[PDB]
Design a binder for these strands. Structure first.
Length: 112
DNA sequence: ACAACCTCCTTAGTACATGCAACCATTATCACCGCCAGAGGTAAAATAGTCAACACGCACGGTGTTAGATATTTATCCCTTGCGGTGATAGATT
């Protein structure tokens, strides 16, 4: 209850058309349960930082592989999104259309 | 005591029919990297084998000659033309 607002200010970032303007807040409100259970204030650190790690990634996963058509081990989910993040160079440095042939040097790896 | 009635309140339930043409994108979001699985790698030997050696041995294809077929040439024959003589049709009657 004391943290229900911090769940909005983190979650609402990700609700940006992502799947809906709403639902990620309520999944953050369940990530907050694991956070409240493992709240090691006995290290010294603050619940702001706790939320910035754990509750943020509960908010991320709430529509990463949850609510999709498809779901995989998570390294192989967000790696598809590493490529979309890298494409921000491609679309302006090769800079007319995207080319997997450029992505091969930007990943140092074979396409297949 | 209730009853519906005066007024504009808002709510929200629908919006006819047949057909053809077009192509299928946008998001970001640390997945972290730690562990170890059976599990990737590969050495040495099972399930068994390569292809080079020297033999083996054969088929196929091209060069040569032969064969006979075919398309020409020739000339014959028939079926056809066009006109003509005169046909019994068309059909009205018996």
């Amino acid at each position: 209850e004391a943290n229900l607002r911090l769940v909005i200010s983190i979650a609402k970032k990700y609700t940006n058309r992502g799947l809906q303007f709403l639902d990620l807040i309520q999944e953050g409100n369940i990530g907050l349960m694991k956070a409240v259970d493992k709240f090691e204030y006995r290290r010294g650190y603050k619940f702001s930082t706790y939320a910035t790690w754990w509750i943020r990634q509960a908010i991320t996963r709430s529509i990463a592989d949850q609510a999709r058509t498809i779901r995989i081990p998570v390294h192989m989910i967000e790696t598809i999104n590493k490529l979309n993040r890298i494409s921000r160079q491609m679309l302006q440095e090769m800079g007319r259309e995207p080319t997997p042939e450029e992505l091969a040097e930007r990943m140092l790896m074979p396409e297949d």
